[PDB]
Amino acid sequence: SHVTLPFYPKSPQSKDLIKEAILDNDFMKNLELSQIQEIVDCMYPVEYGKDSCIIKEGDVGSLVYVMEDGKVEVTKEGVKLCTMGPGKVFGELAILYNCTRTATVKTLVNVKLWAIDRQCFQTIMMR
Amino acid sequence: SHVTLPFYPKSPQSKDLIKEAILDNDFMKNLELSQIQEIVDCMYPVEYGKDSCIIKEGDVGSLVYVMEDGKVEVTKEGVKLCTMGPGKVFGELAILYNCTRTATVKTLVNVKLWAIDRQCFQTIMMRT
Ligand SMILES: Nc1ncnc2c1ncn2[C@@H]1O[C@@H]2COP(=O)(O)O[C@H]2[C@H]1O
């Protein structure tokens, strides 16, 4: 009758980094534990090498990311806004407020991320 | 019980200029009209004389501004980035990224602004 969310096995310390990264993000410090637990179980791993463009400002959004290793640079209109380290969320705006990517994310080093797709996250709001 | 956002009574003209500034921001046009209203109500007035620096690059962010009157010039690392007048929103970037101000805003003539602070600004974005 109702949808089933994909489940991705994780190390307990991965699980811990994701959660805490979520609590750290301004626009998600309002989520119920139950809901954060559902997010944590739903992210999947993705790696990018250095000099990689993950998010292009203007394109549409479908993935929200938590960074486990590495360091990324954020730019809007060729302007360096800031850099981001592990334990930080990003690419959340276009998923929450259904807009287009507000800036571009390039990698500086190799990075390992967690990512959750459009569909899954929506469902986790219906709580 | 949740928190209670402050109310700032406003001239209809102003309540409308602000709605304009917001709808013209290249990110905030995507907000629900309710959220836009809640914002409008939470803005409050600030005045600056000319040759004054409102936002300094590298600083911690706290306030988003809308501009009612005046001209301001946005810069960075010494370089100019654009003139700017009434109806525009600025200072959204540092809030949208829990990072630091990315530019330096200075007046050019006497200016008048509306300002929402970041706690209000985010409390509003957590809806519906
Ligand atoms: N290249 C640019 N063109 C126009 N406005 C800008 C530019 N860069 C920054 N700003 C504005 O200037 C503000 C300076 O502080 P913020 O980064 O918080 O938000 C910024 C934007 O509102």
Structure tokens at A80: 């360096």
CATH number 2.60.120.10 given to A1-127: yes
CA B111/CA B86 separation, integer angstroms = 9
Contact call for residues B121 and B75 (beta carbons, < 8 A): no
Method by which the model was determined? X-ray
Which amino acid residue places its CA nearest to atom 11 of ligand 1? Answer: B90
Output DSSP code: residue A45.
Answer: E
Helix (H, G, I), strand (E, B) or coil at A57: strand
Which residues have C-beta within 8 Å of that of residue B91, sequence separation ≥ 6? B55, B61, B63, B64, B65, B101, B105
Deposited resolution, Å: 2.8
Residue B100 annotated as part of some ligand binding site: no
CA B37/CA A105 separation, integer angstroms = 32
Instruction: Walk across the sheet containing A72-76 and list its strands.
Output: A53-55, A104-107, A72-76, A79-84
Centroid of ligand 1 to alpha carbon of B91 (angstroms): 6
CATH of domain B1-128: 2.60.120.10
Which residues have C-beta within 8 Å of that of residue A66, sequence separation ≥ 6? A17, A18, A21, A22, A43, A87, A88, A89, A113, A114, A115
Q: CA torsion sign, B98 to B22 to B125 to A120?
A: negative
Centroid of ligand 1 to alpha carbon of B26 (angstroms): 12
Q: Which of B97, B100, B126 sits opposite A30 (nearest CB)?
A: B126
DSSP run (H or E) holding A12: helix A12-24
- B81 chain-A contacts, CB cut-off 8 A: 79
A79 lines ligand 1 (CB under 6 A): yes
DSSP readout, chain B? -----------HHHHHHHHHHHHHSTTGGGS-HHHHHHHHHH-EEEEE-SS-EEE-TTPBP-EEEEEEES-EEEEETTEEEEEE-TT-EES-HHHHTTSB--SEEEESS-EEEEEEEHHHHHHHHS--
Structure tokens at B127: 């809806």
The number of beta carbons lying within 10 Å of the beta carbon of residue A83 is 11
Strand partners, B72: B84, B107
B104: cis peptide before it, omega within 30°?
no
